């Protein structure tokens, strides 16, 4: 996979800039007090046999008709009857200010602190509506002055919200607690401050001392620019030496000080007061956001002027290096930018990635910011760490106006970034048509290449940006320029699967059988990736279907390896040769027999492809199939008439191959097709020999079930009981004498399977041998008995068991050599000892 067609850094640098500059945002959630909703008297319709009358009674309460009400009370009407919302007669009377009705209702035994569905007492309803007189009656009758409705609202909160001075002043005098807050954390002070009721704020502040009530109020004052309130709130904040402990520098939950907040909304007036009260100009929140950053991001020109004058660091940088000049520039606040510059903000300050303020302005298509920065002599082609110019960035974003400006300001349209990427390469990758045309007009080289040899047209074709591919061709781009792999735009278009692009290049003269590395054409790549439609397209434009790679693979061979059945079909239907060979001498059928592509194999056999095609090695597809344990494909061939008696150059049949690699199923299938087992190679090898040698227990069983001789000698005189001993095949040999394999059999050098079993130290092997008729006294050609071999190689346990069976130690060779003469010749100390005990 090509990962080289990515300007890898830039998306990920936009994000770093974004999410460390999108996070300078005061969560007004806790600075905007929640406002109470008053209980709407309902239509008061019937909802019981007293249904119509309970409803008629409530309307009488709302209208303040004491007379009609008393008659209902005497008439059997329950005084606690209410509407859908839980509003009773005392609530309705309370809202309208019908004082006399209220005393009367309380007199008739109406529950005072009876609450509605929303938790409103008569006192809540009365306070919000400003019925000071109803309240005096309610307070005096012992109503709960600190009762809370559903969201935590208290009567003092409501009175402050609706600027009912007299109610507030009264509620406070009777010990109402203004510290008691809502669920979202708002106090009567906070809401009075939010509503701009300075008169109410003044009163509330006179009663309570706590900064616990005060701090959230101050933040709100900061947002609302309430200088008058801010001054009052800070009446007790004494100038201390530890700034973070002064109330004016205490933060919200977002780490923002009051000054950050004033900076955000551009509240010069409140900020000035805050600062005069010892506000810290460079207190930081989150990832190093100073107030100066915030005002800068916000374009609050006058705030910036103020913070700088108060000793605010013009060059403070965030965690990734944003200076205030970066921020104003990113946001397109040209007036703030020129100001920061004029106050001497560092013009070429860099972020972690090396972007200057000019790069930020280029991102946001901010013309005026770019003009001011260039005006103050910012290098038009100033580069980042990845060697991107402002022009590279504007092209990636597809920003026309800034691109046009930068080019007019003599930016190099061929400036090469880190990987040779030009602005034109990037514009073509991000499919930026208007920018792309603009760059060409200002002189970008149409056929410049990257460090990996990619041209603009390689890139646009690979990305499928069709309109771009066209424009490049219309501007003279050659579709035959090669990258470092030697691939053209067609190769890259085929690799990506961009069908309409492949067509376009082809209708525009692309060399169809253009050779890349390994001499592979686009037809080869399409076949490998199973791009069926593209295989048809190339073939339609005179692609030679028998074109081979360096190692000799045709697109058909490739179909066989990848199991592309559909691809294989289009090729054969185009006149693809079905029996061409690779450098290793494999036909497409062989390849299918190696990778187990059964559907491809079937399609080939139906096309007059030889089931028994050979190579330089003389191997058929069946041989191959047998080796790689491809059971179905192996079965397919036999049915399509592949000889199981087919031999290679070495002499191996398919049965031979299956025997060695323990291919049970494939071995079974061959035998069912009449595969002879008693057939030898050049050096006298049967599949029975190969099966035994590798120690394939069940395999030797199957070979003898279907007629194999257990006694066939090689050209050196070795049977399969010989080989089962040479490779310590204990299980194999134990089945072989169960079917009668003579041990007495000698080779051409006259050594029996009892000579071999003793030469490699096989204890249990020599035991079972003497158990079916083998003799310890049996000599070889040189004269060696089992005790002559067991005394030569220092086998201690084999001499012991040989002397327990009757191996005479007084036997010589033809030149006169006993077991004791070899054991003394090599210095074996416990071996000369046991030959003189027996």
Author numbering: 1584 to 1630, 2026 to 2816
Text lifted from the article:
Ankyrins are a family of scaffold proteins which play essential roles in connecting numerous ion channels, cell adhesion molecules, and receptors to the spectrin-based cytoskeleton beneath membranes and thereby provide mechanical support for plasma membranes and control the activities of excitable tissues including neurons and muscles. There are three members in the human ankyrin family: ankyrin-R/B/G (AnkR/B/G) encoded by ANK1/2/3, respectively. They all consist of a highly similar N-terminal membrane binding domain composed of 24 ankyrin (ANK) repeats, a spectrin-binding domain comprised of two ZU5 domains, and a UPA domain followed by a death domain (DD) and a variable C-terminal regulatory domain. The wide-ranging physiological functions of ankyrins are the result of ankyrin's remarkable capacity for binding to and anchoring numerous membrane targets, via their N-terminal 24 ANK repeats, to specific membrane micro-domains in coordination with spectrin-based cytoskeletal structures. The 24 ANK repeats of ankyrins form a superhelical solenoid with an extremely conserved elongated inner groove, which contains multiple quasi-independent target binding sites.
Using isothermal titration calorimetry (ITC)-based quantitative binding assays, we identified a 48-residue auto-inhibitory segment (residues 1577–1624, referred to as ‘AS’) as the complete ANK repeat-binding region. After extensive trials of screening and optimization, we succeeded in obtaining good-diffraction crystals of AnkR_AS fused at its C-terminus with the AnkB_repeats and solved the structure of the fusion protein at 3.5 Å resolution. The residues connecting AS and ANK repeats (10 residues in total, ‘GSLVPRGSGS’) are flexible, indicating that the fusion of the two chains together does not introduce obvious conformational restraints to the complex. The 24 ANK repeats form a left-handed helical solenoid with each repeat rotating anti-clockwise by ∼16°. The inner αA helices and the finger loops of the 24 repeats line together to form an elongated concave inner groove, and the αB helices of the repeats form the solvent-exposed convex outer surface. The ANK repeats superhelix has outer and inner diameters of approximately 60 Å and 45 Å, respectively, and a total height of ∼150 Å. In the complex, AS adopts a highly extended structure binding to part of the inner groove formed by the N-terminal 14 ANK repeats (R1–14) with its chain orientation anti-parallel to that of ANK repeats. A 10-residue segment of AS (residues 1592–1601) forms an α helix when bound to ANK repeats. The binding of AS to ANK repeats can be divided somewhat arbitrarily into three sites (sites 1, 2, and 3) formed by the repeats 2–6, 7–10, and 11–14, respectively. The interactions in site 2 are mediated both by hydrophobic and hydrogen bonding interactions, while interactions in site 3 are mainly hydrophobic.
